[PDB]
Amino acid sequence: EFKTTPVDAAFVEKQKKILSLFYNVNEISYEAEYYKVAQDFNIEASKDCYTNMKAYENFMMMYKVGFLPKNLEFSIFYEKMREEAIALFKLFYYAKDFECFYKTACYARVYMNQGMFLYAYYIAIIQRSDTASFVLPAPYEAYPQYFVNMEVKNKMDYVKMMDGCLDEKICYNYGIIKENEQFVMYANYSNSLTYPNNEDRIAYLTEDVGLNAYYYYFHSHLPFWWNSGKYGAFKERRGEIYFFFYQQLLARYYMERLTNGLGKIPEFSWYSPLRTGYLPPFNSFYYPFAQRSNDYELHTEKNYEEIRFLDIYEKTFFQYLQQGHFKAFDKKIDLHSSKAVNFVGNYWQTNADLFEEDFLQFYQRSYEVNARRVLGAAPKPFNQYTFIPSALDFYQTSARDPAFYQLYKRIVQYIIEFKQYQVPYTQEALHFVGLKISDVKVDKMVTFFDHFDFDAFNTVYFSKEELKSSPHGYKVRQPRLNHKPFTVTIDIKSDVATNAVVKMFLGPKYDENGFPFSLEDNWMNFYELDWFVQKVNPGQSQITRSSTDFAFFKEDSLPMAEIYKLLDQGKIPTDMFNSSDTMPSRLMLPKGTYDGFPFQLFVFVYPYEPTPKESEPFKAVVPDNKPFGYPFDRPVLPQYFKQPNMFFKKVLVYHEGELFPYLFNIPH
C-alpha cells in the first residue's frame, strides 16, 4: 500500500528507543525504561558526553537556576523560553554518540516542560547526522491538543472519566464508537462560531492536520534561530528557500480560495482595523486561546510600540530598494546579484544567517515574531513563563488563522517588489535548442473527501496502573480532502539524445472575474508539482508520469501503532523517512466542482547540467543549480514564454461524492 524500506536490526533498537519518548508525553511512567535511565543519569558528572564544553556548561548555568516548569505552554516566540529550548537543543546535538543523546533525552523527558522537550527533541532528531534517517511520529500524534478541536477533546475526556461508554447507542449518536476495543470519535471541521465569516468555506484546508503538520516540519528542518552551516553550499541560498516556501503555500491557498468562490488574499495596515476574525477552539492549562473579533483595531494602546517597530522594519526595506546599492550587517550588496536574494529572505525572517552568527541572540528582534503578537490579539504575558496562547504562537496551529496568510502574503509582496530589480530571462536562456513538446494529455483529476484516523491518546490522562502498559486507543476520525491518482503524458520530439529536466506547475486559468490571467500577473500563483531527470531519445518519444511519483508530495503518515508493527517486519515507511517535510499527497489538488474547475498545467523541459552530490535540509532542494521555482522565480516577459519546449494545458479539476465534509459525520 505505502512505500516501504527494508531496515536492519540495529536500526530497529534505536528507532524503538526514539519512538518510546513519545508515549503519554503528558505524564511520567515510573517503571518505563526512560525513567530509570533518567534517575541514573548524573548530568553533573558527564561533561565527557559532549562534543562542546561551552554548550554543556551553558546548560548547567541555566539548569541550576531552573527552567520553564512542567505543564505550561511552550512557544519558541518568547525569549526566555527560546533560550532554554536552544540550550537543550545544543546538548542534544553535541551529544557524542546515540547513547549519550538517548540518556539526555530521557533526562529532559522527565525533568522538563514537555512542549519544550518535544520541540528540541524533534529538531535534534532531524539535525543530528546519526539520526538523519530515523522516523518521527506525526506532530498530530505528538501534540494532539493542537490539532483536535475542543468539542472532540471534551468528548474524549468524558469517556476517560466514565471509563468507557454508558451505552453504545447514546455514544453512537454523539459520534463515539468502539472499534477493536479502541474509541473512535468523529470530528467535524469548525462552524461559523470559530470562523465568523467566509473564511469558514475553507476550514477543511486550513484546519487540515496534514497542512498544519507540514508547516511544523518545515520549521523543524531549519529553524530561524539556527545558522545553516550544517548544510554548506546551501547557506548561500537560504533566503531563497524562504521566499519559495511561502510563495508556494500562498499559491496553494489562493487556489483553494478560488474553487470556493473567495477571491484575493486581503491586504491590511497596522493603523487600521483588520477585517477577518478568528476564534480558536483551543485552550492551555490556564487560558483559552486568544480570540480576534471581526474588525479588530490593530492600532490600540497595547500595540503602539510593536507597530512602530513593524512599520519601520518594512520601510527600511523600501529604503534599500530606493537606494539600489544597499548594505546591512557588514557588506555592501548589489540588487542585481543573488547574494541579494539571499539577503532578502534572511531579512524578512531575521534568521541567524542575517547576522552571520550561529544562534540567534537574545536582543535581536524579529519582524515575524512581532507581527504574530500583534495579529494574535492576546493580552500581554503575565510573566516570562506565562503567556496567553493564540494560533500564531505555534507552528502546529498557525495555518488555521486567516491572518497568517495575510501576514505572509504581505511579506511575499514586498519580496516581489525586489524581484522587479532582477533581470528577466531572455529567449536564449529558456530555449532548449533542438527539442519541442508536441502535446500534453492528463487523466481525470478528481478530488473527494474520505475518512482519516489518528491516535489522540497523548491528550488523555491515564492511571498509574494503565501507564505500565503504554495505553493508546483514542482515535479521532476526520473527513479529509483527497484525490485519485492521475498520469501526465508528455510528447517530445528532439534532434539529439540528451538528459533533460522536466518540471510541472499548477496555476489558475481565470481570475475571480472570469478573465484569463497573463503570465506577467500570474507567475507567482503557480506551484510546483514535480521535478525529474529524463533521458530523451532522438526523434519522437513519450514520457508518462504518475501523481504518486511527484517529487514534492508525500503519503500520509502512519500512526505509531503501525510503525511498531512494520518495525517488527524490519520495514519502515519510505515517505516518513525520506521526506517528512513535504506536502501531503491528498492536498495536492484544490477541491474541484462536479462541474470541473478550470486550472492550467505548465510543463517545462530544459537541459540537465550535471550538478554533484549534497545532503540539504528540504526535498525542495533539487540536484540543480537553477533558482527554486525556475523559470517562475522572477517577473516574466510573456513573449519569451512561447518556447517550443514549454506547454500550457487547460485541465479541469472535478469533485466526487459529497461536497461538504460534515455529510460524513452524520449518525444515522
Ligand X SMILES: *[C@@H]1O[C@H](CO)[C@@H](O[C@@H]2O[C@H](CO)[C@@H](O[C@@H]3O[C@H](CO[C@H]4O[C@H](CO)[C@@H](O)[C@H](O)[C@@H]4O)[C@@H](O)[C@H](O[C@@H]4O[C@H](CO)[C@@H](O)[C@H](O[C@@H]5O[C@H](CO)[C@@H](O)[C@H](O)[C@@H]5O)[C@@H]4O)[C@@H]3O)[C@H](O)[C@H]2NC(C)=O)[C@H](O)[C@H]1NC(C)=O
Ligand Y SMILES: *[C@@H]1O[C@H](CO)[C@@H](O[C@@H]2O[C@H](CO)[C@@H](O[C@@H]3O[C@H](CO[C@H]4O[C@H](CO)[C@@H](O)[C@H](O)[C@@H]4O)[C@@H](O)[C@H](O[C@@H]4O[C@H](CO)[C@@H](O)[C@H](O)[C@@H]4O)[C@@H]3O)[C@H](O)[C@H]2NC(C)=O)[C@H](O)[C@H]1NC(C)=O
Told to check if 69 binds ligand X by CB under 6 A, we report yes
Q: Specify the residue, 149 or 351, whose C-beta has the smaller distance to ligand Y.
A: 149
Pair type for strands 325-326 and 333-334: antiparallel
Of 114 and 190, CB closest to ligand Y: 190
Cα 357 from Cα 363, distance rounded (Å):
13
User: Helix, strand, or coil here: 584?
Assistant: strand
* DSSP conformation letters of 380-435: PPSBTTB----GGG-TTTGGGSHHHHHHHHHHHHHHHHHHTTSPPPPHHHH--TTE
Q: Which residue is nearest to ligand X (CB)?
A: 66
The stretch among 73-81, 232-240, 551-559, 659-667 that binds ligand Y (CB under 6 A) is 659-667
CA distance 231 to 615: 7
- Tell the smallest beta-carbon distance from residue 385 to ligand X (Å): 9
Q: Judging by DSSP bridges, how do beta strands 498-508 and 487-494 pair with one another?
A: unpaired
- Of the CA atoms within 13 Å of residue 334, those in its CB half-sphere come to 4
The partner residues of 603 in beta bridges, in order of sequence, read 504, 647
Q: Which does 271 bind (CB under 5 to 8 A by kind): its own copies, ligand X, ligand Y, none?
A: its own copies
| Residue 510 touches its own copies, criterion: CB under 8 A | no
Q: Where are the alpha helices (DSSP H) in 440-524?
A: 464-467, 519-522
Query: Which of ligand X, ligand Y, its own copies, none has residue 660 at its interface (CB below 5 to 8 Å by kind)?
Result: none
Residue 69: name its binding partner from ligand X, its own copies, ligand Y, none (Cβ under 5 to 8 Å by kind).
ligand X
CB within 8 Å of 224: residues ≥ 6 apart = 349, 350, 351, 352, 360, 366, 368
Handedness of CA 516, 520, 522, 526 (dihedral sign): positive
Q: Does 66 bind ligand X (CB under 6 A)?
A: yes
**What's the CA gap between 631 and 342, in Å, rounded?**
18
Task: Phi first, then psi: give them for residue 491, nearest 5 degrees.
Answer: -105, 125
- Under rule CB under 6 A, residue 662 binds ligand Y: yes
- Decide which of its own copies, ligand X, ligand Y, none touches 667; Cβ closer than 5 to 8 Å per partner kind: ligand Y
Options 139, 144, 175, 629; binder of ligand Y; rule CB under 6 A:
175
Kindly state whether residue 461 participates in binding its own copies, applying the rule CB under 8 A: no
Confirm or reject binding of residue 665 to ligand Y (CB under 6 A). Answer: yes
Q: Which is closer to ligand Y, CB of 477 or CB of 509?
A: 477
Nearer to ligand X among residue 285 and residue 363 (C-beta): 285
323 binds its own copies (CB under 8 A): yes
H helices within 227-303, ranges in order? 238-259
Taking CB within 5 to 8 Å according to partner kind, which of ligand X, ligand Y, its own copies, none is near residue 450? none
Residue 93 one-letter amino acid: Y
Stretch that binds its own copies, among 296-304, 389-397, 493-501, 604-612 (CB under 8 A): 296-304
Q: Answer yes or no: are the C-beta atoms of 141 and 580 closer than 8 Å.
A: no
Partner whose footprint covers residue 132, from ligand X, ligand Y, its own copies, none (CB < 5 to 8 Å by kind): none
Q: Look at residue 639 and give the partner it binds from ligand Y, its own copies, ligand X, none, a contact being a CB closer than 5 to 8 Å depending on partner kind.
A: its own copies
- Least distance from its own copies to the Cβ atom of residue 522, Å: 13
CB of 186 to ligand Y, least distance (A): 4
**DSSP single-letter state for residue 452:** E
Cα angle 404-408-411, degrees, rounded to a multiple of 5 = 150
* 295 interacts with its own copies by CB under 8 A: no
**Cα 570 from Cα 144, distance rounded (Å):** 28
Q: Cell 461536497, residue?
A: 659
Q: Is 319 in the site for its own copies (CB under 8 A)?
A: yes
Sole binder of ligand Y in the list 122, 147, 186, 278 (CB under 6 A): 186
Nearer to its own copies, 332 or 668 (CB): 332
Report the amino acid identity of residue 219.
H
Site stretch for ligand Y (CB under 6 A), options 414-422, 520-528, 649-657, 660-668: 660-668
Q: CB 71 → ligand X: shortest distance, Å?
A: 9
- Written as one string, the DSSP assignment of 327-395 is --TTS-EETTSSHHHHHHHHHHHT-TTTTT-SB--TT---HHHHHHHHHH-PPPPSBTTB----GGG-T
Among its own copies, ligand X, ligand Y, none, the one that 318 touches (CB under a kind-dependent 5 to 8 A) is: its own copies
CB of 663 to ligand Y, least distance (A): 7
**Site for ligand X, residues 534 to 593, rule: CB under 6 A:** none
Looking up cell 502498559, which residue turns up? 469
* Shortest distance, position 382 Cβ to ligand X, whole Å: 9
If binding is defined by CB under 8 A, does position 305 make contact with its own copies?
yes
CB of residue 667 to ligand Y, shortest distance in Å = 5
How far is Cα 528 from Cα 580, in angstroms, rounded to an integer?
Answer: 17
Cell digits of residue 567: 518495525
Cβ(531)–Cβ(502) under 8 Å? yes
Residue 667 as a binder of ligand Y (CB under 6 A): the answer is: yes
Q: Which does 662 bind (CB under 5 to 8 A by kind): ligand X, ligand Y, its own copies, none?
A: ligand Y
Give the binding site for ligand Y (CB under 6 A): 175, 186, 188, 662, 665-667
Q: What residues line the site for ligand X (CB under 6 A)?
A: 66, 69
Summarize as ranges the residues that interact with its own copies (CB under 8 A): 65, 266-269, 271-272, 299, 301, 304-305, 308-309, 311-316, 318-319, 322-325, 328-330, 362-363, 384, 413, 420-421, 520, 639
